[PDB]
Design an enzyme around this catalytic site. Structure first.
Site, mmCIF file in Angstrom:
data_model
loop_
_atom_site.group_PDB
_atom_site.id
_atom_site.type_symbol
_atom_site.label_atom_id
_atom_site.label_comp_id
_atom_site.label_asym_id
_atom_site.label_seq_id
_atom_site.Cartn_x
_atom_site.Cartn_y
_atom_site.Cartn_z
ATOM 1 C CD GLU A 78 -2.600 -1.464 2.292
ATOM 2 O OE1 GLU A 78 -3.285 -0.280 2.625
ATOM 3 O OE2 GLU A 78 -3.559 -2.443 2.191
ATOM 4 C CB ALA A 83 1.558 14.472 -4.470
ATOM 5 C CD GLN A 89 1.561 20.688 -7.029
ATOM 6 O OE1 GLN A 89 1.251 21.401 -7.890
ATOM 7 N NE2 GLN A 89 1.264 20.236 -5.928
ATOM 8 C CB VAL A 90 4.135 22.902 -12.806
ATOM 9 C CG1 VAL A 90 3.061 22.284 -13.275
ATOM 10 C CG2 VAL A 90 3.794 23.654 -11.628
ATOM 11 N N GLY A 92 9.150 19.369 -11.775
ATOM 12 C CA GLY A 92 10.100 18.202 -12.229
ATOM 13 C C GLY A 92 10.694 17.505 -10.998
HETATM 14 C C1 LIG Z 1 1.394 14.937 -9.076
HETATM 15 C C2 LIG Z 1 2.927 15.781 -8.794
HETATM 16 C C3 LIG Z 1 3.853 14.802 -8.060
HETATM 17 C C4 LIG Z 1 3.452 15.958 -10.290
HETATM 18 O O1 LIG Z 1 3.841 17.318 -10.464
HETATM 19 P P1 LIG Z 1 4.352 18.060 -11.881
HETATM 20 O O2 LIG Z 1 4.075 16.785 -12.943
HETATM 21 O O3 LIG Z 1 6.018 18.036 -11.867
HETATM 22 O O4 LIG Z 1 3.677 19.225 -12.203
HETATM 23 P P2 LIG Z 1 2.389 19.693 -12.042
HETATM 24 O O5 LIG Z 1 1.608 19.901 -13.312
HETATM 25 O O6 LIG Z 1 1.798 18.685 -11.048
HETATM 26 O O7 LIG Z 1 2.511 21.100 -11.237
HETATM 27 C C5 LIG Z 1 1.188 21.623 -10.578
HETATM 28 C C6 LIG Z 1 0.006 21.985 -11.577
HETATM 29 O O8 LIG Z 1 -0.090 21.027 -12.582
HETATM 30 C C7 LIG Z 1 -1.032 20.295 -12.197
HETATM 31 N N1 LIG Z 1 -0.930 18.941 -11.814
HETATM 32 C C8 LIG Z 1 -0.713 18.443 -10.443
HETATM 33 N N2 LIG Z 1 -0.516 17.399 -10.334
HETATM 34 C C9 LIG Z 1 -0.312 16.921 -11.853
HETATM 35 C C10 LIG Z 1 0.430 15.624 -12.069
HETATM 36 N N3 LIG Z 1 0.477 14.494 -11.696
HETATM 37 N N4 LIG Z 1 0.479 15.651 -13.739
HETATM 38 C C11 LIG Z 1 0.307 16.817 -14.364
HETATM 39 N N5 LIG Z 1 -0.190 17.919 -13.968
HETATM 40 C C12 LIG Z 1 -0.387 17.910 -12.585
HETATM 41 C C13 LIG Z 1 -2.119 21.158 -11.474
HETATM 42 O O9 LIG Z 1 -3.179 21.720 -11.931
HETATM 43 C C14 LIG Z 1 -1.038 22.025 -10.613
HETATM 44 O O10 LIG Z 1 -1.826 23.236 -10.757
HETATM 45 P P3 LIG Z 1 -1.394 24.526 -9.993
HETATM 46 O O11 LIG Z 1 0.077 24.231 -9.548
HETATM 47 O O12 LIG Z 1 -1.214 25.765 -10.961
HETATM 48 O O13 LIG Z 1 -2.330 24.611 -8.983
HETATM 49 C C15 LIG Z 1 2.554 17.096 -8.090
HETATM 50 O O14 LIG Z 1 2.093 18.221 -9.031
HETATM 51 C C16 LIG Z 1 1.529 17.286 -7.009
HETATM 52 O O15 LIG Z 1 1.810 16.539 -5.974
HETATM 53 N N6 LIG Z 1 0.057 17.278 -7.204
HETATM 54 C C17 LIG Z 1 -0.963 17.467 -6.386
HETATM 55 C C18 LIG Z 1 -0.840 16.021 -5.860
HETATM 56 C C19 LIG Z 1 -1.421 15.057 -6.889
HETATM 57 O O16 LIG Z 1 -2.088 15.242 -7.806
HETATM 58 N N7 LIG Z 1 -1.171 13.597 -6.467
HETATM 59 C C20 LIG Z 1 -1.641 12.356 -7.170
HETATM 60 C C21 LIG Z 1 -0.601 11.873 -8.101
HETATM 61 S S1 LIG Z 1 0.276 10.442 -7.381
#
Ligand SMILES: CC(C)(COP(=O)(O)OP(=O)(O)OC[C@H]1O[C@@H](n2cnc3c(N)ncnc32)[C@H](O)[C@@H]1OP(=O)(O)O)[C@@H](O)C(=O)NCCC(=O)NCCS
Length: 166
Positions: A78, A83, A89-90, A92
């Site tokens: 599990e 995240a 985020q966004v 890398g």
């Molecule tokens: C998921 C995550 C690890 C990846 O981040 P990332 O791919 O480097 O870049 P992200 O695109 O996520 O950056 C954030 C933005 O993109 C979007 N985004 C969030 N998670 C994302 C993901 N997994 N993939 C693509 N876009 C994502 C969101 O709309 C966010 O908008 P905002 O920051 O203007 O409010 C990170 O963004 C995160 O922790 N997001 C919230 C948690 C989540 O969604 N967890 C589930 C995945 S296991």
């Protein structure tokens, strides 16, 4: 290994600094994740001891990270969840963890992962390699154990000799 980022292996042993950072992860997920059940991430993130790897955007400035623990006699695992925090985020970083998660998923000999991932983490997981869908119909989502109502029963088949990183 390119990247100035810093990772750390935390636990809910109740030390001190590990908790503060471990906390960040918990809120980070449940935060960006549609008010997902906090107790859920908390349960899996603080499910007794457990092992997790976080991120540090300043050596100690938590930003992302994943937490989990597989079952041996169960052959199932599990994930507390991975995240990066909201407008952090966004950049890398997260993906760096999801992969680190797989490498470990193989070092434990557990390939039957599990979670209650929603459309959000769903596609995000299926993208990093995970598999939200299973040989069985989605209708059987209920029964994965732990947490009631919140996301979808997701699983990560850690097949042997798979190209994950090793
Ligand atoms: C998921 C995550 C690890 C990846 O981040 P990332 O791919 O480097 O870049 P992200 O695109 O996520 O950056 C954030 C933005 O993109 C979007 N985004 C969030 N998670 C994302 C993901 N997994 N993939 C693509 N876009 C994502 C969101 O709309 C966010 O908008 P905002 O920051 O203007 O409010 C990170 O963004 C995160 O922790 N997001 C919230 C948690 C989540 O969604 N967890 C589930 C995945 S296991």
């Amino acid at each position: 290994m390119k990247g100035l980022l810093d990772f750390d292996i935390l636990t809910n042993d109740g030390t001190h600094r590990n908790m503060k950072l471990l906390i960040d992860l918990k809120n980070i997920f449940s935060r960006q994740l549609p008010k997902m059940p906090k107790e859920y991430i908390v349960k899996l993130v603080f499910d007794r001891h457990h092992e997790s790897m976080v991120i540090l955007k300043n050596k100690q400035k938590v930003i992302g990270g994943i937490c989990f623990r597989q079952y041996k006699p169960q052959r199932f695992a599990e994930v507390a969840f991975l995240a990066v925090t909201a407008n952090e985020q966004v950049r890398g970083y997260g993906t760096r963890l999801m992969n680190k998660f797989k490498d470990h998923m193989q070092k434990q000999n557990i390939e039957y992962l599990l979670t209650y991932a929603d459309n959000f983490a769903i596609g995000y997981f299926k993208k990093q390699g995970f598999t939200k869908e299973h040989r069985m119909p989605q209708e059987k989502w209920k029964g994965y154990i732990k947490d009631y109502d919140g996301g979808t029963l997701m699983e990560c088949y850690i097949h042997p000799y798979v190209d994950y990183g090793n």
